[PDB]
Each structure stands twice: as C-alpha cells, then as structure tokens.
C-alpha cells in the first residue's frame, strides 16, 4: 500500500511539508493503560518484544489514540547482543543484564554477526507485520543502538553509572575493544539493513552513552563507528532514500562532527536550543527534537506554548523556515504522564506549524 502520510520522511530529507511532523520517544509505554494491560497479560518485556504479533500490537497502540506522524518499532537495542549469545535477562525492576558479559579477548573472539532472519527473526517479522497493519497510514521507524552504546552494555553486563570496565578496556586493551566494536558495527549495519528490507522506512541509531567519553575517546571509539554505519549502510538515493537519524544526549559538542557523517538527521534533547543546533550543524541535516518531556506535566496552555517555542526557535535558526524539523521529545515519556496532555501536544504541533 502506498504511504499516505510521508510528512516524517520529507522533513527528514529537508523537503517542504504542510505542517511539522511529530512522533514521541516511548510513545508505546506504561503511560498508556492498554500497554500496561498487554504487559500484564504477556508477562514480561521480552514476552512482548520477542513475539511479533504483540510487538505489533504495542507499536500500534499510541496510533489508536493520537494522530502521530510515525510508528516506531517496539523492541530494545539489546536484541543484537542477545542474539550473539550473551543471554539478556531482566530482574523485576532492576534493568537489563547479561549472563555472559564480554570481559576478555576470548569472549570478544566468540562474537559473530547474527543471521538476521533466523536469530533476529522476531524483529524482522514484527517489522513486516507492522508495515502490513499500518497499510500506508504513516511510516515505520526501525532502530538500533550505536556500536559504542551496545559495547557498553556488553562489557558491563548491564547498565552502569560510570562505565569503568569498558573505559579501562579502551585504555589497556584498545585493540581488543576495536575488534569488539568492529563486529558490533557489522552487526548494526546488517540489522538496520534487514529492518529496511523488511519494511522500515526510516532508521534511527541511539548513541545513548556516547557522552561519557572525552573528545579524543569519542572520536576513536564511537564516532568512528557511526561514520562506518553511515558509509556502509545502503539506503537508496535522493528523494527516495531511507533516512538515517543519529540520536545522542547532552552531546551538543559533537553536533558539528555528527552533521558531517552523511546521516540525514540528528535527534537531540533540550540541553541546547534548536537554533544553536542549526548553527552548529550548518544546515547539513534535519533536526529531530527537542522538548523536555516533563513539559507534559504542565497545563495544556503551557504545553501548547512550549510546542510553539520549540517550533519557533527552530525556525529562527533556519532563516525563518520551519522545514527540515521533526518534532520530538528529548527523552521518553514517563509512566505517570497523562494521555490527554499527549493529545494536546500533538494537536498543538500540527496547528502552530501550519505552512
Ligand atoms: Cl521510542
Ligand atoms: Cl514505560
């Protein structure tokens, strides 16, 4: 079925649209009662994410309420290292962990690029099912973690406050860490390409933990591999290309370098204003963001005003033009947020940004 709303894709390509598209980080999440109901029946995050029909159900839930301009695949960045044999698990209310963290050269040497349609078939089947169920209503965004951010979880065995283990590896065994990052990057390229082939119409890379690095270490251990993704991932050409989005947080110091990777768009948070982001990226990329999600606790009038502020700040840094912007939050919605205020935000973005 032909895509009937391609606002998102045009904006990511810096092509003119009728109003600014919006989608929201964690738009499938516990702030929706129906998400909580699905989660209680399924039984765990993995019981939803590894079963295509449920991942599809969850992906489509926000679109049953809100006129969002995109769906984002319901999954987790840690599918890739789970498929590589590290055994992802969740302890009730503790965050993701791996049974087999990657701690030595032998563990690094065991890693291989998963067979995407077999080992990660639950992801690809979900992409196909979502694309079929959407039937051209709005585009589907696929995604991956960045190689650096995946490596962080793989070495640490879970989340970390300071990433001491992977940083010690960078200092004491950089050749081993580069080999880990090389195979992980090949996996990310294969994973994103397989999602595109299965039906994903835009692709986002999350470099959640790129900001823990010094400038030199960021260039060597994260940016190098983001560049490899941009160069090595086939996405088509021109007005039909599958857009590539790179997201980072508190990373306004790397916006210049990220804007030169070849990615189409950069996603960012509220720690810098979008006009400054336009200045540092030189007009080379579309920008996605950047509303602080705690705005959704404010009054409806304040939410509408804040959406107008984000939109008008972008335009002021873009020669007065609203084009090349995808409205989004800078961090995912929280479980206690009010769906009414989400609807207020979505309508306000569309209304205020009418061309
Ligand atoms: Cl999301
Ligand atoms: Cl949530």
Full DSSP string of 211-238: GGS-HHHHIIIIIHHHHHHHHHS----G
Other Cβ atoms within 10 Å of 170 Cβ, number: 21
User: DSSP 3-state assignment of 313?
Assistant: helix
**Contact status, residue 267 vs residue 23, Cβ threshold 8 Å:** no
User: Per this entry, what is the length of the chain?
Assistant: 355
Q: What are phi and psi of 216, to 5 degrees?
A: -65, -45
For residues 264 and 234, what is the distance between their CA atoms, to the nearest angstrom?
13
Q: Is 30 designated active site?
A: yes
Residue 76 Cα to ligand 1 midpoint, Å, equals: 9
Residue 145 contacts residue 188 (beta carbons within 8 Å)? yes
Rg of the chain on CA atoms, in Å: 19
Place of tokens 């992980």: 184
Euclidean distance between CA atoms 335 and 326, whole angstroms: 23
Task: Report the distance separating Cα 259 and Cα 126, nearest Å.
Answer: 31
Cited resolution, angstroms:
1.5
Of 34, 113, 124, the C-alpha closest to 80 is 113
Among the options 10, 26, 228, 322, which is catalytic? 26
Q: Is 227 left (phi over 0), alpha (psi -120 to 50) or beta?
A: alpha
Quick check: 58 and 49 in contact, CB under 8 A?
no
Smallest Cα–Cα separation from 247: which of 17, 21, 59, 26? 26
Q: Which residues contact 126 (CB under 8 A, 6 or more apart)?
A: 52, 55, 56, 59, 73, 74, 75
The SS3 call for residue 332 is coil
Separation of CA 86 and ligand 1 centre (Å): 24
Alpha helices in the chain (DSSP H): 7-12, 33-42, 45-49, 52-60, 79-81, 105-110, 116-119, 121-134, 147-156, 164-172, 174-198, 215-218, 224-232, 255-258, 274-281, 300-316, 339-352
Task: Identify which of 66, 70, 53, 249 has the alpha carbon closest to the alpha carbon of residue 142.
Answer: 70
Are the C-beta atoms of residues 216 and 257 closer than 8 Å to each other? no
- Going by the annotation, the residues of the binding site for substrate are 26-30, 76, 153, 208, 331
Instruction: Fill in the DSSP letter of residue 293.
Output: G
Strand partners, 142: 203
CA of 135 to the centre of ligand 2 (A): 26
Distance 26 CA to ligand 1 centre (A): 4
Going by their DSSP bridges, the two strands 202-206 and 71-72 should be labelled as unpaired
- Are the C-beta atoms of residues 160 and 90 closer than 8 Å to each other? no
Q: What gap in Å lies between CA 307 and CA 286, rounded to an integer?
A: 18
Q: Are 224 and 213 in contact (CB under 8 A)?
A: no
CA separation, residue 253 to residues 227, 256, 258 (Å) = 17, 7, 10
The full DSSP string for 164-196 is HHHHHHHHH-HHHHHHHHHHHHHHHHHHHHHHH
278 by Cβ neighbours in 10 Å (0-12 / 13-18 / 19+) ranks as buried
DSSP class of residue 355 equals -
Give the C-alpha separation, 296 to 211, whole Å. 26
Q: Round to whole Å and give the CA distance between 185 and 245.
A: 16
Experimentally, the structure was elucidated by X-ray
The DSSP call for residue 202 is E
Strand pairing report for 88-90 and 96-98: antiparallel
Given 10, 14, 35, 153, the catalytic residue: 153
The CA-atom distances, in angstroms, between 197 and each of 76, 111, 126, 141 are 19, 24, 12, 12
Phi, psi of 172 (to 5 degrees): -100, -25
Rounded Cα distance between 297 and 102, Å, is: 40
Which entry of 65, 76, 89, 179 is annotated as an active-site residue?
76
Residues 6+ apart with CB under 8 A from 93: none
Q: Are 261 and 227 in contact (CB under 8 A)?
A: yes
Which-ligand-closest: CA of 29? 2
Report the CATH number at residue 251. 3.20.20.210
Q: Any idea which ligand is nearest the CA of 62?
A: 1
Q: Is the link from the previous residue into 290 a cis peptide, with omega within 30 of 0?
A: yes
Task: Write the burial class of residue 345 (CB in 10 Å: 0-12 exposed, 13-18 middle, 19+ buried).
Answer: buried
Element (DSSP H or E) covering residue 145: strand 140-145
- Give the helix/strand (H/E) hosting 88: strand 88-90
The structural domain count of the chain equals 1
3 state DSSP class of 75? coil
Active-site residue flag, 218:
no
CA proximity to 318, closest of 280, 268, 271: 280
Catalytic: 14? no
CB atoms within 10 A of CB 93: 5
Of the listed ligands, the closest to the CA of 59 is 1
Domain span holding position 28: 1-355
Ligand 1 centroid to 59 CA: how many Å? Answer: 10
């Amino acid at each position: 079925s032909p895509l009937r709303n391609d606002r998102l894709l045009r904006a990511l390509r810096r092509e003119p649209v009728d109003c600014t598209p919006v989608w929201l980080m964690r738009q499938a999440g516990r702030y929706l009662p129906e998400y909580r109901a699905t989660r209680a029946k399924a039984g765990s995050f993995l019981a939803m994410a590894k079963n295509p029909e449920i991942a599809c159900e969850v992906t489509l839930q926000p679109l049953r309420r809100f006129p969002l301009d995109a769906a984002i695949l319901f999954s987790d960045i840690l599918t890739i290292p789970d498929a590589m044999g590290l055994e992802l698990y969740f302890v009730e209310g503790e965050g993701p962990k791996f049974r087999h963290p990657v701690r030595d050269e032998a563990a690094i040497a065991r890693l291989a690029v998963p067979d995407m349609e077999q080992d990660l078939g639950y992801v690809m089947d979900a992409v196909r099912l979502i694309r079929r169920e959407l039937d051209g209503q709005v585009p589907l965004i696929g995604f991956s973690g960045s190689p650096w951010t995946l490596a962080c979880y793989m070495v640490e065995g879970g989340g970390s406050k300071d990433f001491a283990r992977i940083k010690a590896m960078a200092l004491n065994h950089p050749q081993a860490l580069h080999r880990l990052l090389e195979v992980t990057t090949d996996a990310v390229i294969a994973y994103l390409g397989a999602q595109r082939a299965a039906g994903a119409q835009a692709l986002q890379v999350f470099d959640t933990w790129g900001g823990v690095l010094s400038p030199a270490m960021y260039r060597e251990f994260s940016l190098r591999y983001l560049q490899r993704i941009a160069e090595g991932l086939e996405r088509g050409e021109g007005s039909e290309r599958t857009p590539l989005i790179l997201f980072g947080k508190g990373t306004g110091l790397h916006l210049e370098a990220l804007s030169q990777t070849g990615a189409d768009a950069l996603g960012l948070d509220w720690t810098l204003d979008l006009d400054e982001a336009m200045r540092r990226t030189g007009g080379r990329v579309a920008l996605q963001g950047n509303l602080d999600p705690t705005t959704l606790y404010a009054s409806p009038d304040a939410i509408a005003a804040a959406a107008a502020r984000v939109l008008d700040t972008y335009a002021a840094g873009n020669g007065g033009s609203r084009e090349g912007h995808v409205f989004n939050l800078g961090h995912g919605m929280s479980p206690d947020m009010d769906p009414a205020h989400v609807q207020v935000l979505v309508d306000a973005v569309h209304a205020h940004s009418q061309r």
